[PDB]
Design an enzyme around this catalytic site. Structure first.
Site, PDB file in Angstrom:
ATOM      1  N   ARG A 127      -0.187   4.416   2.881  1.00 51.31           N
ATOM      2  CA  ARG A 127      -0.042   4.259   4.551  1.00 51.31           C
ATOM      3  C   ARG A 127       0.310   5.256   5.363  1.00 51.31           C
ATOM      4  O   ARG A 127       0.502   5.175   6.466  1.00 51.31           O
ATOM      5  CB  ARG A 127       0.829   2.942   4.630  1.00 51.31           C
ATOM      6  N   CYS A 177       0.775  -1.187   0.129  1.00 56.81           N
ATOM      7  CA  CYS A 177       0.071   0.250   0.135  1.00 56.81           C
ATOM      8  C   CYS A 177       0.773   1.407  -0.047  1.00 56.81           C
ATOM      9  O   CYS A 177       1.734   1.317   1.039  1.00 56.81           O
ATOM     10  CB  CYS A 177      -1.025   0.079   1.015  1.00 56.81           C
ATOM     11  N   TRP A 190      -9.400   6.582  -0.325  1.00 56.19           N
ATOM     12  CA  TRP A 190      -9.606   7.128  -1.462  1.00 56.19           C
ATOM     13  C   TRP A 190      -8.671   6.892  -2.299  1.00 56.19           C
ATOM     14  O   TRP A 190      -7.344   6.187  -2.142  1.00 56.19           O
ATOM     15  CB  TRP A 190      -9.522   8.861  -1.095  1.00 56.19           C
TER      16      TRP A 190
HETATM   17  C1  HEM Z   1      -6.424   6.521   1.931  1.00 59.13           C
HETATM   18  C2  HEM Z   1      -5.900   6.428   0.592  1.00 59.13           C
HETATM   19  C3  HEM Z   1      -5.181   5.016   0.094  1.00 59.13           C
HETATM   20  C4  HEM Z   1      -4.366   4.951  -1.145  1.00 59.13           C
HETATM   21  C5  HEM Z   1      -4.130   6.215  -1.878  1.00 59.13           C
HETATM   22  C6  HEM Z   1      -4.189   3.545  -1.284  1.00 59.13           C
HETATM   23  C7  HEM Z   1      -3.404   3.274  -2.480  1.00 59.13           C
HETATM   24  C8  HEM Z   1      -2.980   1.872  -2.753  1.00 59.13           C
HETATM   25  C9  HEM Z   1      -2.533   1.498  -4.057  1.00 59.13           C
HETATM   26  C10 HEM Z   1      -2.367   2.420  -5.429  1.00 59.13           C
HETATM   27  C11 HEM Z   1      -2.507   0.193  -4.136  1.00 59.13           C
HETATM   28  C12 HEM Z   1      -1.815  -0.547  -4.982  1.00 59.13           C
HETATM   29  C13 HEM Z   1      -2.703  -1.806  -5.465  1.00 59.13           C
HETATM   30  C14 HEM Z   1      -3.722  -1.573  -6.667  1.00 59.13           C
HETATM   31  O1  HEM Z   1      -2.960  -1.008  -7.584  1.00 59.13           O
HETATM   32  O2  HEM Z   1      -4.560  -2.043  -6.933  1.00 59.13           O
HETATM   33  C15 HEM Z   1      -2.866  -0.340  -2.749  1.00 59.13           C
HETATM   34  C16 HEM Z   1      -2.882  -1.565  -2.324  1.00 59.13           C
HETATM   35  C17 HEM Z   1      -3.224  -1.733  -0.705  1.00 59.13           C
HETATM   36  N1  HEM Z   1      -4.010  -1.067   0.231  1.00 59.13           N
HETATM   37 FE1  HEM Z   1      -3.941   0.997   0.094  1.00 59.13          FE
HETATM   38  N2  HEM Z   1      -4.534   2.938  -0.335  1.00 59.13           N
HETATM   39  C18 HEM Z   1      -5.277   3.747   0.619  1.00 59.13           C
HETATM   40  C19 HEM Z   1      -5.839   3.479   1.788  1.00 59.13           C
HETATM   41  C20 HEM Z   1      -5.905   2.161   2.309  1.00 59.13           C
HETATM   42  C21 HEM Z   1      -6.624   1.674   3.545  1.00 59.13           C
HETATM   43  C22 HEM Z   1      -7.712   2.581   4.648  1.00 59.13           C
HETATM   44  C23 HEM Z   1      -6.552   0.349   3.614  1.00 59.13           C
HETATM   45  C24 HEM Z   1      -6.681  -0.639   4.930  1.00 59.13           C
HETATM   46  C25 HEM Z   1      -6.936  -0.236   6.079  1.00 59.13           C
HETATM   47  C26 HEM Z   1      -5.394  -0.002   2.648  1.00 59.13           C
HETATM   48  C27 HEM Z   1      -5.008  -1.322   2.390  1.00 59.13           C
HETATM   49  C28 HEM Z   1      -4.403  -1.824   1.018  1.00 59.13           C
HETATM   50  C29 HEM Z   1      -3.865  -3.120   1.150  1.00 59.13           C
HETATM   51  C30 HEM Z   1      -4.047  -4.394   1.977  1.00 59.13           C
HETATM   52  C31 HEM Z   1      -3.226  -3.310  -0.391  1.00 59.13           C
HETATM   53  C32 HEM Z   1      -2.672  -4.512  -0.854  1.00 59.13           C
HETATM   54  C33 HEM Z   1      -3.704  -5.565  -1.357  1.00 59.13           C
HETATM   55  C34 HEM Z   1      -2.834  -6.845  -1.927  1.00 59.13           C
HETATM   56  O3  HEM Z   1      -1.999  -7.216  -1.378  1.00 59.13           O
HETATM   57  O4  HEM Z   1      -3.097  -7.040  -3.363  1.00 59.13           O
HETATM   58  N3  HEM Z   1      -5.351   1.185   1.591  1.00 59.13           N
HETATM   59  N4  HEM Z   1      -3.201   0.973  -1.979  1.00 59.13           N
HETATM   60  C1  LIG Z   2      -4.750  -3.882  -9.541  1.00 53.91           C
HETATM   61  N1  LIG Z   2      -4.586  -4.889  -8.433  1.00 53.91           N
HETATM   62  C2  LIG Z   2      -5.279  -6.155  -8.614  1.00 53.91           C
HETATM   63  C3  LIG Z   2      -6.741  -6.126  -9.077  1.00 53.91           C
HETATM   64  C4  LIG Z   2      -4.659  -7.322  -7.511  1.00 53.91           C
HETATM   65  C5  LIG Z   2      -5.833  -6.878  -6.079  1.00 53.91           C
HETATM   66  C6  LIG Z   2      -6.399  -7.738  -5.386  1.00 53.91           C
HETATM   67  C7  LIG Z   2      -7.081  -7.743  -4.323  1.00 53.91           C
HETATM   68  C8  LIG Z   2      -7.390  -8.582  -3.961  1.00 53.91           C
HETATM   69  N2  LIG Z   2      -7.875  -9.485  -3.192  1.00 53.91           N
HETATM   70  C9  LIG Z   2      -7.258  -6.390  -3.721  1.00 53.91           C
HETATM   71  C10 LIG Z   2      -6.522  -5.272  -4.679  1.00 53.91           C
HETATM   72  O1  LIG Z   2      -6.738  -3.947  -3.952  1.00 53.91           O
HETATM   73  C11 LIG Z   2      -5.610  -3.253  -3.616  1.00 53.91           C
HETATM   74  C12 LIG Z   2      -6.149  -2.015  -2.800  1.00 53.91           C
HETATM   75  C13 LIG Z   2      -6.960  -2.371  -1.592  1.00 53.91           C
HETATM   76  C14 LIG Z   2      -7.264  -1.162  -1.009  1.00 53.91           C
HETATM   77  C15 LIG Z   2      -7.274   0.093  -1.650  1.00 53.91           C
HETATM   78  C16 LIG Z   2      -7.992   1.319  -0.913  1.00 53.91           C
HETATM   79  C17 LIG Z   2      -8.421   0.989   0.342  1.00 53.91           C
HETATM   80  C18 LIG Z   2      -7.773   2.535  -1.600  1.00 53.91           C
HETATM   81  C19 LIG Z   2      -7.152   2.856  -2.850  1.00 53.91           C
HETATM   82  N3  LIG Z   2      -6.904   4.017  -3.394  1.00 53.91           N
HETATM   83  N4  LIG Z   2      -6.677   1.380  -3.271  1.00 53.91           N
HETATM   84  C20 LIG Z   2      -6.680   0.277  -2.925  1.00 53.91           C
HETATM   85  C21 LIG Z   2      -6.098  -0.932  -3.618  1.00 53.91           C
HETATM   86  C22 LIG Z   2      -5.743  -5.658  -5.714  1.00 53.91           C
END
Ligand code: HEM
Ligand SMILES: CN[C@H](C)Cc1cc(C#N)cc(OCc2ccc3c(C)cc(N)nc3c2)c1
Ligand code: HEM
Ligand SMILES: CN[C@H](C)Cc1cc(C#N)cc(OCc2ccc3c(C)cc(N)nc3c2)c1
Ligand SMILES: C[C@H](O)[C@H](O)[C@H]1CNc2nc(N)[nH]c(=O)c2N1
Ligand SMILES: C[C@H](O)[C@H](O)[C@H]1CNc2nc(N)[nH]c(=O)c2N1
Ligand SMILES: [Zn+2]
Lengths: 407, 411
Positions: free
Chosen positions: A109, A106, A278
């Site tokens: 964070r 993430c 967001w």
């Molecule tokens: C508040 C603004 C936040 C931003 C801008 C943000 C941004 C991102 C981005 C860009 C990714 C890349 C994954 C993807 O491309 O789909 C990601 C992954 C992730 N985010 Fe954040 N996030 C935010 C908040 C949060 C919150 C509130 C949580 C949980 C409490 C969280 C938990 C996670 C987790 C667990 C992943 C990895 C999931 C995986 O292992 O595939 N995020 N986040």
């Molecule tokens: C493009 N990434 C591919 C689709 C893989 C992926 C798998 C899973 C799951 N399970 C969950 C995933 O989510 C990541 C994630 C989780 C939480 C987010 C929050 C809370 C905010 C944000 N802007 N992006 C997030 C992005 C991604």
């Protein structure tokens, strides 16, 4: 064994010791790196609880106190009797915040300690879940001033009574396969869209149809629910220079709320724990819009831009990709919905890293996921070495429910 | 044990068995990944196993494993080692080794070409002047008037480590960098330290923004010597933009031949500390990294100004916009001048094809995702969605310390 990470743009060097607190495994070995792989009982429970309560009471500076040992004793006794145990509210909030803090993939964070935790452990039914989820969405949306939140449903017991949200995100657009051959709406959501219909959902078969909630309480058959449209904040996508951009007919939702992951705290498993923050602009504009397996509007946009698309070396995809992402940011900003660009977010993350090395001894970080999907080397994280390791509490992947559910 | 990788854009799945042949270590463990870490006097004792393993691979590749020529060669090498404490590769072996070091280079996106490497054997070289001659011929051959051809020149192997051959340049052709009194940098900031060493060794610097550096060459452990590449051998391309007529006025140019000269080639336990190799550029290497890295020429700002972009807030993506145009100009310029270059879309596409072919015919292809994904537009290139396995195979190219940090000066 006390490892260093160097930033090659600034020469800043940080020293990592936090990794020695790592318990779980990475998937790599000495002979092979799996860094780019997407997904690499009473007995086991007590050490897990002890380790958690140990870090908890350290964080409140009462390690080795009456309170600590008592609670340790207390949970100890409960595990032996009830075969599980329940977290105090304070521990639940700490656990959730630290699951986010520990999410090595993430980039957002730096905000981790400001998470709003909603205790929904008293929930018993899918209607109840729907209520808790509507309240989550309304609170998190906050009329465009987005606020981070997680809602935590009852923990797994015997794996037969799982609470699960079947949607991958609370708010996502439908995906329909055409007789024409291609795909209308969101291709990533074609199978889930089918299941919803297969469950009794009346699909409008539009391009941006908000999917129904498919909620599973206590292990029973999941149930369809429609999120009140007035709770679903959407942003029409326009371009600050290109008038014709509106005519593409694009919009996206404000609230990214991931709902299919498992929250692990002190060995306890929360299988339904939707969390939201967001968007980073690229999540929508680069991935959601321009992945070949997604909305794939690249050709259409470049066409409208009259770029030379006859050779790749004109970099027409790159030019269009930038414009699309300029629009997404412009649109969200114009409609006063929280969003962050990839330059701002990565700069924040480098600052967050600085802080974590300084006050915690390190920060687990997955370079492959932290570097944005566009313009990588002109963002500060590209030149940042990172150490990836797994700390608990944590968010984890879990099977899709329809591959598991005993109907 | 078999391992699988999945391309998540196409759902294609491939099975790696080659990782079993891996000997060297990655830097990772079961509890930590060092995937994004930049970098994570050998006796006759440990040398023959390394030799044997290499000769087994060599003779397997030519379908002569277990033959009399194989066994005799093993015998010959064994005796030569315990007699001379080292050994010499046959020409055939040298060529094979160098091609496979490239084939094994997990961070190299250009490996579809690996088998078409021109190998120049410079193991008879004894002096720096001789090195200069070999390198001149490399450059002329490689450049081929813009129709670039891959080549490597291999100088004598390390013996006791007190008699190393080294090219002190990081690349054969690179621009000078000069730290100014006011803190500014003229030329290429990446080359300031090397430039200073050259100036100290007696180089007379033009002190311009694009001065080709002299060669600083070390033979047999002696103090290095300065040589000037004849300018007619150095092919350069003025950078202009196909629509922005003001872009030429930025005064930019780059050289055509990327030729890396500070790495070490390891073959069957032998160490070739001087082994300059060259191919041709991927556009982003110049347009993204060389021009736009904050620590390089860093022309983003100036380009953004002339485009009159909103540079007030970053969320205007003026940086992103300027980057694409700079990279457009670089490709346009090289192609206009008929100098070989490849864009990042074409190159990553080829690599996926190369990779799939390698999995089928070889059982795998070690790949470093962190390095394979281009520094711009990552996810719209097909390597982004491609899972990869990184492991270390020999023959290989390895990093080595900058010679000025280890060299014993004669005077
Ligand atoms: C508040 C603004 C936040 C931003 C801008 C943000 C941004 C991102 C981005 C860009 C990714 C890349 C994954 C993807 O491309 O789909 C990601 C992954 C992730 N985010 Fe954040 N996030 C935010 C908040 C949060 C919150 C509130 C949580 C949980 C409490 C969280 C938990 C996670 C987790 C667990 C992943 C990895 C999931 C995986 O292992 O595939 N995020 N986040
Ligand atoms: C493009 N990434 C591919 C689709 C893989 C992926 C798998 C899973 C799951 N399970 C969950 C995933 O989510 C990541 C994630 C989780 C939480 C987010 C929050 C809370 C905010 C944000 N802007 N992006 C997030 C992005 C991604
Ligand atoms: C012919 C066209 C070639 C192209 C387009 C190409 C492209 C690249 C690129 C883009 C990188 C990443 C390095 C960076 O961005 O800084 C790289 C790394 C590398 N290349 Fe290639 N290359 C080519 C030929 C060769 C040849 C001929 C050799 C050797 C015989 C070679 C060996 C390597 C090695 C060893 C690395 C890893 C360097 C490191 O670990 O730092 N390449 N290549
Ligand atoms: C920005 N990359 C930084 C400077 C790290 C790096 C270190 C070394 C070394 N030693 C060598 C490096 O070069 C990689 C490389 C090697 C050979 C190449 C050839 C033959 C062609 C080409 N287009 N790029 C190359 C790129 C890079
Ligand atoms: C810290 C990080 O590993 C480092 O900046 C790497 C990342 N990926 C790269 N990829 C390429 N092609 N070239 C590079 O120099 C780098 N640098
Ligand atoms: C193959 C590769 O592991 C996969 O495409 C990963 C790479 N990096 C990513 N980075 C982010 N932020 N999100 C992703 O889904 C992915 N996908
Ligand atoms: Zn690893």
């Amino acid at each position: 064994r006390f490892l260093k990470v160097k930033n090659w743009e600034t020469d800043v060097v940080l020293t990592d010791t936090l990794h020695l607190k790592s318990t779980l495994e990475t998937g790599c070995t000495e002979h092979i790196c799996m860094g780019s792989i997407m997904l690499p009982t009473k007995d086991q429970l007590f050490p897990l609880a002890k380790e958690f309560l140990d870090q908890y009471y350290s964080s409140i500076k009462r390690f080795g106190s009456k309170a600590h040992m008592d609670r340790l004793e207390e949970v100890n006794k409960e595990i032996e009797s009830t075969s599980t145990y329940q977290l105090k509210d304070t521990e639940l909030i700490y656990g959730a915040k630290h699951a986010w803090r520990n999410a090595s993939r993430c980039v957002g964070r730096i905000q981790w300690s400001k998470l709003q935790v909603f205790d929904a452990r008293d929930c018993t039914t899918a209607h109840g879940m729907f209520n808790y989820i509507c309240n989550h969405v309304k609170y998190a949306t906050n009329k465009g001033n987005l606020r981070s939140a997680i809602t935590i449903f009852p923990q797994r017991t015997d794996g037969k009574h799982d609470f699960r949200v079947w949607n991958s995100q609370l708010i996502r657009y439908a995906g329909y396969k055409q007789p024409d051959g291609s795909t209308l709406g969101d291709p990533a959501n074609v199978q889930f869209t089918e299941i919803c219909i297969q469950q009794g959902w009346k699909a409008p078969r539009g391009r941006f149809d908000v999917l129904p909630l498919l909620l599973q309480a206590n292990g029973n058959d999941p149930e369809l629910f429609q999120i009140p449209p007035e709770l679903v904040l959407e942003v029409p996508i326009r371009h600050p220079k290109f008038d014709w951009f509106k005519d593409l007919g694009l919009k996206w939702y404000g609230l990214p709320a991931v709902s299919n992951m498992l929250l692990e705290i002190g060995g306890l498993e929360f299988s339904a724990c939707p969390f939201s923050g967001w968007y980073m602009g690229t999540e929508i504009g680069v991935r959601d819009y321009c992945d070949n397996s997604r909305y794939n509007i690249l050709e259409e946009v470049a066409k409208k831009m009259d770029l030379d698309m006859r050779k790749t070396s004109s970099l027409w995809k790159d030019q269009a990709l930038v414009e699309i992402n300029i629009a997404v940011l412009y649109s969200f900003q114009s409609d006063k919905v929280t969003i962050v660009d990839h330059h701002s977010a990565t700069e924040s993350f480098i600052k967050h890293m600085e802080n974590e090395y300084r006050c915690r001894g390190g920060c687990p970080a997955d370079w492959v996921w932290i570097v944005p999907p566009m313009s990588g080397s002109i963002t500060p994280v590209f030149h940042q070495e990172m150490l990836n390791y797994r700390l608990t509490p944590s968010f984890e992947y879990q099977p899709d429910p329809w591959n598991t559910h005993v109907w």
